[PDB]
Amino acid sequence: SNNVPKNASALLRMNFVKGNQVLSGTGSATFIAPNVLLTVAHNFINNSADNSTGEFIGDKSKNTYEWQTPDGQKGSFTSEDIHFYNKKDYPKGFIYDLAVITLPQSTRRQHANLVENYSKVNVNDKLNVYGYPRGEYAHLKDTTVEIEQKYANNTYGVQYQGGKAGMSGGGIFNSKGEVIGLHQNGAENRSGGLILSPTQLDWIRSIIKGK
């Protein structure tokens, strides 16, 4: 499992369509089943005009998205394949910036494991975070947790140095190489991510066990 985190780390390409015009962006995701990706909701949605709900970037019926792994393999998906943890309350905080993508059953990729049991991450813990800042592969090796934020019971944001734009959606890994969280912010307003709660882990597994 030495190379399992790296080889599960996918680049995301997003093509947001509006009318007959398209704008593109990039992000990151992690394979946690042969045909299931973990990522952030904000690769796909943003705040509604009044911040009351999450809302698709571009036209959801026209958008196209793509994943690519380090070995060069790639595949496509659409909005029909995206499962948001909570699109309605997405604007309320990073606790809801969470999404799972179910790819076709013909996708049979090697993947990392979602952690079986929740383990609280503490300040001064060292994490391993993978992603594609500016679309380029990057591994934040043993980056230290400096600040924690309790979003809800057993639901913590953590801050660690290293993230830049494009890395959001990349995986946070424990020392065994299991997925425990995901990177969410690499902008100038503090790099960090979300450590998945027992509830969020169960929800992801419910999506996996549909596949």
Author numbering: -1, 684 to 893
Task: Quote the study on this structure.
The 1.75 Å resolution structure of the G. haemolysans M26 IgA1 protease trypsin-like domain is presented. To gain insight into the structure and potential functional role of this domain, we solved the crystal structure of GhTrp and demonstrated that the domain does indeed possess a trypsin-like protease fold. This fold, however, contains many unique changes in the well characterized surface loops that are known to contribute to trypsin-like protease specificity. As expected, the GhTrp crystal structure depicts two molecules in the asymmetric unit, related to each other along the c axis by a tNCS vector of approximately half the c-axis length. Despite having low sequence identity (<20%) to most known chymotrypsin-like and trypsin-like proteases, DALI analysis demonstrates that the fold of GhTrp is consistent with other members of the S1 family of glutamyl endopeptidases, as categorized by the MEROPS database. Loop 1, which contains the serine nucleophile (Ser167) and the oxyanion-hole residues (amides of Ser167/Gly165), is similar in structure between GhTrp and BGP but is truncated when compared with bovine trypsin. Taken together, these data suggest that the GhTrp structure could represent a pro-enzyme-like form of the putative zymogen in which some activation event is required to properly stabilize loop 2 in an active conformation to generate a viable S1 pocket. We hypothesize that this putative pro-enzyme form must undergo a specific cleavage event to generate an N-terminal segment that interacts with loop 2 to stabilize a more open and active conformation of the S1 pocket.
Immunoglobulin A proteases (IgAPs) represent an interesting group of proteolytic enzymes that have convergently evolved to specifically cleave the unique hinge region present in IgA1 from humans and great apes via several different chemical mechanisms. The M26 IgAP family can be split into two subfamilies with distinct domain architectures. The subfamily represented by the Gemella haemolysans IgAP (GhIgAP) contains an additional trypsin-like domain (GhTrp) found N-terminal to the IgAP domain. Prior studies that compared GhIgAP constructs with and without this domain concluded that GhTrp had no effect on IgA1 proteolysis.
